[PDB]
């Protein structure tokens, strides 16, 4: 089943070229309450990390002149060992993989408008989005 | 009459370990609003900030012309400034709002 796992979420990164950029030497951070980070919170020691992949537009692909896109993604990260609350941010969320060894709940398939989904201590999520 | 603004300048940053330092550092585009990331990057004319951190506001501009002005959080005090004509009038929250080619101060 773990090698299932394995496999699955190396094509993912395979699959993505947002998680895969040359230049970054288009994130936005995110609070518990589902706000952007400013400086002590981005400071101060955290068990929980929320961050979106903004963007799409890379330079290219490797071939003459064309440019792709690929779709905006939403990581959280729960390694707090408790159970806590997530206030998403904008616009509809879709989760493509998880920690959870456990069947997924209906309202954790999709989730939109920032309401907040109840996420499990010691989880990691990856949501992509699908509008607009 | 500049000779004794450049002394009374000068004065203040002899007067205050609040620049004194190695890095607290504020932030304020306009109007009102708390820096963020578009605003971050774009070719325009507006710096505010402040130090917590003695505190002091501290708002400087370049530019063509007006722009609406609003003062952030926590009372502010006026101690020195640049100057078309004089100090009138009397300029916690509220709306001041600064003019041109310009630049401008404040305490707590």
Do not use: A, C
């Given at each position: 089943k773990f090698l299932e796992f394995v496999k699955k979420m190396i094509q993912f990164y395979r699959a993505h070229p947002a998680f895969r950029r040359e230049r970054y030497f288009d994130v936005t951070f995110y609070t518990l309450e589902g706000r952007e980070v400013d400086e002590k919170t981005w400071s101060s020691p955290t068990q929980l990390v929320i961050f979106v992949l903004e963007g799409s537009v890379m330079?290219?692909?490797?071939?003459?002149g064309e440019r792709i896109a690929d779709d905006s993604f939403l990581i959280i990260l729960n390694a707090n060992p408790n159970n806590v609350k997530v206030k998403f941010p904008k616009g509809k969320w879709e989760l493509v993989?998880?920690?959870?060894l456990r069947e997924i709940k209906p309202e954790e398939r999709i989730i939109e408008g920032e309401k907040e989904l109840e996420i499990e201590g010691r989880t990691a999520l990856v949501y992509r989005r699908i509008e607009l």
């Open positions: 330079d290219e692909i490797n071939m003459y993989i998880s920690s959870y």
